[PDB]
C-alpha cells in the first residue's frame, strides 16, 4: 500500500465517535482525551460542521487545537460524532489518497 | 598486545552499573577536591 493520488472523489466517510458506551452499565461518556485525539488528530473533515461558533470547513485538516475545540464542544453538547476522511473508505484500488490518509508525515 | 583503556571500552561495578567510556578528560579541567586531588571517574547520578 502506497500514496499516489489526486483527491479521490468517492465521499463515503468514517464517523469518529466521541462518546463511549458501556463501562458501568449504560451511560454515555466523553472518551478519554488521548483516544479522541488518536481518532481525530491530523484528520480531514468529510463534511463541514459549525460547532461552537466557528465554521470548520469541509476538507480542513483539524490540528491538535481543532480537536481540542471538538472536545470542548462535545462537553457542551453540540456534536456526538465526526465526519472524517479515512483509508477505511478510499476509492483508489491499490493505494490511498491525500485527503483520506491525513496530516501526519 | 597491550590494551590501554580507550573511549570505546566498557567498565562496570559489582552492583550492576555498566557503561562505556564517553570522554577521556585531561586532569587539567576535571572535578578536583579543595586539596589538589582530582577525581578519576564521573558516574552520572541518573542511572541510580
Amino acid at each position: 500500500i502506497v500514496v499516489r493520488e489526486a483527491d479521490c472523489g468517492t465521499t463515503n466517510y468514517i464517523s469518529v465517535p466521541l462518546f463511549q458506551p458501556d463501562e458501568v452499565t449504560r451511560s454515555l461518556r466523553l472518551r478519554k482525551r488521548a483516544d479522541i485525539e488518536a481518532g481525530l488528530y491530523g484528520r480531514v473533515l468529510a463534511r463541514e460542521v459549525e460547532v461552537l461558533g466557528v465554521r470548520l470547513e469541509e476538507g480542513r485538516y483539524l490540528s491538535m487545537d481543532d480537536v481540542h475545540l471538538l472536545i470542548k464542544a462535545a462537553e457542551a453538547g453540540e456534536i456526538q460524532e465526526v465526519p472524517v476522511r479515512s483509508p477505511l473508505t478510499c476509492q483508489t484500488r491499490y493505494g490511498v489518497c491525500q485527503k483520506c490518509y491525513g496530516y501526519d508525515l | 598486545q597491550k590494551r590501554k583503556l580507550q573511549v570505546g571500552d566498557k567498565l562496570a561495578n559489582r552492583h550492576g552499573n555498566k557503561g562505556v567510556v564517553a570522554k577521556i578528560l585531561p586532569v587539567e579541567d576535571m572535578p578536583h577536591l579543595p586539596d589538589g586531588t582530582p577525581v578519576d571517574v564521573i558516574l552520572n547520578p541518573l542511572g541510580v
Binding site: 463501562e23 458501568v24 452499565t25 | 542511572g47
Partner: protein, 152 residues
C-alpha cells in the same frame, strides 16, 4: 448480589479511586516503554504487574456493582441482610457489634464489623431473632452468644 445504600456508596467510591490509580499506573507504564533506556529491569514487569492487580480489582467492583440488589428494610425482626446484630457473651458480659452483609461488602474496618453473608458467624446469625442463642466452632472452643437486639 445484595447491597446497602452504605455498601453501595463505599464500593462505588472505591471503584472511583481505582480508576485514578489505573490512570496513574498507565501513565507510568507508558513512560517506561517510552524510555527504552534501561530495559530488562523490574521496570516493566513491575509497572505492568501492578496495573494488572488494579484492573482485576476493577473487574470485581464493576461485576458486583453492575448487578446488585438494594434491600431497603431497616424495620424488620429476624436477622437478614443489612441487619445490625449485637451479641453478649453470657459469661463475660461482652458486647459484640456486627452487621451481616453480602460477601462483597465484608470489612472488619467498619463501625459495625461487616461480616459476609456466607461467613460462618454470618451463617449462624441469619434467620434468628432477639433472644436466640447459638454456637459455632472456634479454635479455643465454642462460645454461645445471645442476640441482645437488632438495629435497622
Amino acid at each position: 448480589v445484595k447491597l446497602t445504600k452504605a455498601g453501595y456508596e463505599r464500593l462505588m467510591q472505591q471503584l472511583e479511586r481505582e480508576r485514578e490509580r489505573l490512570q496513574e499506573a498507565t501513565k507510568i507504564l507508558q513512560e517506561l516503554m517510552e524510555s527504552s533506556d534501561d530495559y530488562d529491569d523490574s521496570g516493566l514487569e513491575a509497572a505492568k504487574q501492578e496495573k494488572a492487580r488494579i484492573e482485576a480489582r476493577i473487574d470485581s467492583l464493576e461485576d458486583i456493582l453492575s448487578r446488585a440488589v438494594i434491600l431497603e428494610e431497616g424495620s424488620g425482626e429476624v436477622i437478614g441482610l443489612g441487619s445490625v446484630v449485637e451479641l453478649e457473651d453470657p459469661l463475660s458480659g461482652e458486647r459484640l457489634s456486627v452487621q451481616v452483609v453480602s460477601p462483597a461488602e465484608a470489612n472488619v474496618l467498619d463501625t459495625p464489623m461487616k461480616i459476609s453473608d456466607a461467613s460462618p458467624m454470618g451463617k449462624a446469625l441469619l434467620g434468628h431473632r432477639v433472644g436466640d442463642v447459638l454456637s459455632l466452632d472456634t479454635p479455643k472452643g465454642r462460645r454461645e452468644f445471645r442476640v441482645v437486639a437488632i438495629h435497622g
